[PDB]
Amino acid sequence: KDPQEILLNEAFVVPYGTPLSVNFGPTVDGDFLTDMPDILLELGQFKKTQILVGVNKDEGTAFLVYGAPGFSKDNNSIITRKEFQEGLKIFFPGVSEFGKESILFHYTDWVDDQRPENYREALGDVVGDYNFICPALEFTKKFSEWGNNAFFYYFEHRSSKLPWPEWMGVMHGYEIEFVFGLPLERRDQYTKAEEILSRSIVKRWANFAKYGNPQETQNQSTSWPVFKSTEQKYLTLNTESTRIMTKLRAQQCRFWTSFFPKV
Amino acid sequence: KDPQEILLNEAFVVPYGTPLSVNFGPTVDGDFLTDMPDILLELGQFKKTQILVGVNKDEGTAFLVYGAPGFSKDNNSIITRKEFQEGLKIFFPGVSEFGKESILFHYTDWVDDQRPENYREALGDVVGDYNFICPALEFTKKFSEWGNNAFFYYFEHRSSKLPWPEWMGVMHGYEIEFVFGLPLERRDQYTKAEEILSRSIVKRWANFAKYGNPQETQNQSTSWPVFKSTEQKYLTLNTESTRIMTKLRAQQCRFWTSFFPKV
Amino acid sequence: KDPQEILLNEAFVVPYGTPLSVNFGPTVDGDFLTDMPDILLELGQFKKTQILVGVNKDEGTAFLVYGAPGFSKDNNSIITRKEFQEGLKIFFPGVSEFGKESILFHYTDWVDDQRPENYREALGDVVGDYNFICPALEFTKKFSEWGNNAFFYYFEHRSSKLPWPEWMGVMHGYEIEFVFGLPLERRDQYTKAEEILSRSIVKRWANFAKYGNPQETQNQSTSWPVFKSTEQKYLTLNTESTRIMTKLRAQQCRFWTSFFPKV
Ligand SMILES: *[C@@H]1O[C@H](CO[C@H]2O[C@@H](C)[C@@H](O)[C@@H](O)[C@@H]2O)[C@@H](O[C@@H]2O[C@H](CO)[C@@H](O)[C@H](O)[C@H]2NC(C)=O)[C@H](O)[C@H]1NC(C)=O
Ligand SMILES: *[C@@H]1O[C@H](CO[C@H]2O[C@@H](C)[C@@H](O)[C@@H](O)[C@@H]2O)[C@@H](O[C@@H]2O[C@H](CO)[C@@H](O)[C@H](O)[C@H]2NC(C)=O)[C@H](O)[C@H]1NC(C)=O
Ligand SMILES: *[C@@H]1O[C@H](CO[C@H]2O[C@@H](C)[C@@H](O)[C@@H](O)[C@@H]2O)[C@@H](O[C@@H]2O[C@H](CO)[C@@H](O)[C@H](O)[C@H]2NC(C)=O)[C@H](O)[C@H]1NC(C)=O
Ligand SMILES: *[C@H]1O[C@H](CO[C@H]2O[C@@H](C)[C@@H](O)[C@@H](O)[C@@H]2O)[C@@H](O[C@@H]2O[C@H](CO)[C@@H](O)[C@H](O)[C@H]2NC(C)=O)[C@H](O)[C@H]1NC(C)=O
Ligand SMILES: *[C@H]1O[C@H](CO[C@H]2O[C@@H](C)[C@@H](O)[C@@H](O)[C@@H]2O)[C@@H](O[C@@H]2O[C@H](CO)[C@@H](O)[C@H](O)[C@H]2NC(C)=O)[C@H](O)[C@H]1NC(C)=O
Ligand SMILES: *[C@H]1O[C@H](CO[C@H]2O[C@@H](C)[C@@H](O)[C@@H](O)[C@@H]2O)[C@@H](O[C@@H]2O[C@H](CO)[C@@H](O)[C@H](O)[C@H]2NC(C)=O)[C@H](O)[C@H]1NC(C)=O
Ligand SMILES: *[C@@H]1O[C@H](CO)[C@@H](O)[C@H](O)[C@H]1NC(C)=O
Ligand SMILES: *[C@@H]1O[C@H](CO)[C@@H](O)[C@H](O)[C@H]1NC(C)=O
Ligand SMILES: *[C@@H]1O[C@H](CO)[C@@H](O)[C@H](O)[C@H]1NC(C)=O
Ligand SMILES: [Cl-]
Ligand SMILES: [Cl-]
Ligand SMILES: [Cl-]
Ligand SMILES: [Cl-]
Ligand SMILES: [Cl-]
Ligand SMILES: [Cl-]
Ligand SMILES: [K+]
């Protein structure tokens, strides 16, 4: 077949997909991967070394404009409860009615005013917690229980140049340009606070690669503590002040990690 | 009013009740009880002393014949899924559809053959775990976290004289006659194994009252360990062999204690 | 000599044997085995690695029908005290009168009714505790005191196809077919509960071989804890529910391990 005929048919090998569908991805082949990876992780069968893991504050928002009803990058995407419900059918298509109601139960008990954006925000958090944040935190817990140093970050700076609208917040993919040092180029109209943030992240990442320890040692920086089971310390990355916090998304992750897999 | 007019109307002060309805019971009166008792328990505001707490293996079965459809003391009460569902509506009348589906989800994932009695047993366990066993275990955990010795038992002997049918098992109320020593009377046709069981329970209860420690010290008995948070050791009471076990109904109680109150 | 003449004479090289006689077995040869193996075990002179060890609930019953008087696979084998006594002479032929009375003393203090099967059961337990269970537990204790992980199981499921009679219980040899996965073959008329039990044992054994840890990680299974001196946790294997228990046959093994060797 010509490549194009293959590419044209890939979307359709599945009876329904979502904005996050991975139709052709890694499998347990008995070669690269010798067993189901959740078993290897759980029983400590992996390279023993240091890791640096993290996520962005609004991981799930980018995906909402690729099919959730009522959402648009060109307006504030205020949706109703009915829209939120239709939105869960878009992101959880093979999932039982009970499963989808369990999501709604967990994410719509509001604190508290009748804010118009309640349902818009809840959907972005559903999608980002399920697909990115709770699995990164569980991976880091399980990895670190076998004795190696791990360091977790929560990236919470929205780029001053971001071409997507404000309601999408600190989107998935938009820490990358800070990691590779693009705001170090003054000619590019990032802010001064972003130059300093990128410079500090670049130093932490290079120190982690060179020395296994993602510190910034020269500029009275917050010290980045290892992430352990029990305390679960992580470091927030932002232009204002870096903080050590604990137990990121604790109540949400208990839902996705210990209950939802049963559904 | 004459007493009879009061008694006749008590059943009806509530728009629907269940076999377990307590229409007139303890309240927070600012006198006997100075605050909501869950607050006092949680914050350690109670008499500091030893406690002995326990439950019977089939606490919920006695209640099923007072209104769950398909149940009868005069047949084996095999029910269907539909009956099980109607049964939850009888025992959880003010509870949302989602709440009742959550019960069914948690109790009907079977291990495993298509046993006819699956749903009959699941209903007795729902009712006994929610109303008796998980709350006794939570009370004992919370009490013991403030530093006092607590001892938990699981009573699992069905009286040889029990006039209710076999499917009801080790029913609610039927440890009482062992505690008060009725099987010590040989004229009454309990078995010899029941005489010995009652004699040992009577000694443990009297030792607990006299000395704060419910041991039977003279007859090479299993030593009854204190119940602590963390290990949650309890002692099984039966005619065959007494065992030390841990974490009674762990998976079920996590459901009733940490999830169900939200529903 | 022709092989047959050798085989014909093997039974007779010993002045009396028992159903468990090993007339030609391992010896201390100064080659395969460099010293008495109890010395090597006691002083830690063995390969340092993980072990998985376990026993079946009724190890000794299979042997009773190969010579104990009153026993038969074709009836319920209720025996008398005199039969029990003759039975000890069959299984402990070189042992002093005092030694045999010590066995009877330890196993016949009954709890408690005058059950007809008291002596039948006591004999199966004598033979299974002395020959299999207490030595497996002592081996596992002594091995694990030198620092390696060990996991102990107690197998308590009687195969639905077992052609021996009910009184023999969970016999010696009858876990093997669960380990090798024979109940996975639906065409063979094991029950559904046995298919699931075998599937779980097969996974635990393969995980132990591959990873040194006999967990079943995917199906909310009971976690199998290491067996340590002090706590002596073991895992029960059955079709109903898997339990973590402690100190298997504690009172019996103290008899066989610390007293009987003196006799
Ligand atoms: C924000 O936009 C969405 C997206 O749809 C629209 O894009 C707009 C910016 C505008 O150009 C509009 O014409 C275009 O259709 C609106 O949702 C849509 O609403 C329409 C019209 O009512 C529905 O019939 C559509 O099915 C629905 N589209 C999708 C993909 O759901 C949305 O209402 C609007 N929200 C606002 C203004 O708050
Ligand atoms: C076990 O009994 C129940 C209870 O109802 C019955 O009590 C029986 C022992 C017998 O005397 C019967 O006539 C009496 O009604 C049975 O459930 C009942 O089934 C009937 C007839 O089909 C229904 O129409 C009833 O509504 C229902 N009663 C209740 C309270 O649910 C039940 O089927 C039976 N179960 C068995 C035999 O397994
Ligand atoms: C259960 O059987 C044993 C075994 O002996 C017998 O096998 C039976 C099923 C039957 O065919 C019987 O004829 C055969 O001998 C019984 O013990 C035997 O009892 C006999 C007759 O009284 C004694 O004289 C034998 O020596 C004795 N055999 C052995 C090996 O001990 C046994 O009594 C019987 N038990 C029951 C029925 O409870
Ligand atoms: C994988 O197997 C079938 C494949 O069915 C598919 O045919 C393909 C060539 C492709 O075009 C694909 O879109 C189409 O779905 C799946 O069967 C589907 O199941 C649905 C019900 O959900 C039925 O309606 C059809 O048989 C078929 N779908 C449609 C839209 O026609 C099957 O679901 C799948 N296996 C999985 C998901 O595990
Ligand atoms: C307590 O207040 C009312 C009381 O309504 C009741 O009138 C009583 C005298 C008594 O007979 C009782 O059985 C009757 O219910 C409750 O109002 C009920 O709510 C339902 C809907 O669930 C309506 O149908 C009625 O107003 C009434 N019930 C019936 C069966 O007619 C109210 O529910 C209750 N408060 C609670 C439960 O907190
Ligand atoms: C090993 O040495 C002798 C061997 O005596 C045996 O002669 C063999 C060829 C064989 O047939 C065997 O069955 C026979 O016993 C043992 O001597 C026995 O001791 C008993 C008393 O218990 C005497 O009666 C005999 O000398 C002989 N037995 C019989 C039945 O005739 C000796 O016991 C043994 N050593 C051990 C057990 O350590
Ligand atoms: C540290 O501070 C200096 C000057 O005070 C600055 O120029 C540099 O960017 C900082 N370095 C890092 C690694 O953040
Ligand atoms: C202890 O055992 C004796 C005799 O061995 C018995 O009569 C008595 O009932 C037992 N006592 C208790 C307190 O269980
Ligand atoms: C786990 O459960 C699945 C389905 O719920 C079942 O088919 C499989 O046999 C189980 N696996 C193991 C290893 O026990
Ligand atoms: Cl709704
Ligand atoms: Cl904390
Ligand atoms: Cl249904
Ligand atoms: Cl435990
Ligand atoms: Cl005697
Ligand atoms: Cl113990
Ligand atoms: K739930």
Swiss-Prot record, chains A, B, C:
Active-site residues per Swiss-Prot or TrEMBL entry: 59 (charge relay system), 172 (charge relay system)
Cysteines engaged in disulfide bonds, as pairs: 134-253
Annotated phenotype, changing residue 205 to R: In BCHED; seems to cause reduced expression of the protein
Outcome recorded upon mutating residue 28 to M: Does not affect enzymatic activity
Transmembrane segments: none
Tissue: Detected in blood plasma (at protein level). Present in most cells except erythrocytes.
Record note on modification: N-glycosylated. No other PTM detected. The major N-glycan structures are of the complex diantennary type with 1 and 2 N-acetylneuraminic acid molecules (Neu5Ac) making up approximately 33% and 47% of the total N-glycans, respectively. Only low amounts of fucosylated diantennary N-glycans are detected (approximately 2%). Triantennary N-glycans with or without fucose amount to approximately 13%, whereas 5% of the total N-glycans are of the oligomannosidic or hybrid type.
Residues annotated as binding tacrine: 172
Disease field: Butyrylcholinesterase deficiency: An autosomal recessive metabolic condition characterized by increased sensitivity to certain anesthetic drugs, including the muscle relaxants succinylcholine or mivacurium. BCHED results in slower hydrolysis of these drugs and, consequently, a prolonged neuromuscular block, leading to apnea. The duration of the prolonged apnea varies significantly depending on the extent of the enzyme deficiency.
Assembly and interaction partners: Homotetramer; disulfide-linked. Dimer of dimers.
Role this protein plays: Esterase with broad substrate specificity. Contributes to the inactivation of the neurotransmitter acetylcholine. Can degrade neurotoxic organophosphate esters.
Protein family according to the UniProt entry: Belongs to the type-B carboxylesterase/lipase family.
Name of protein: Cholinesterase
Organism: Homo sapiens (Human)
Underlying gene: BCHE
Positions spanned in the full protein: 295 to 557 of 602
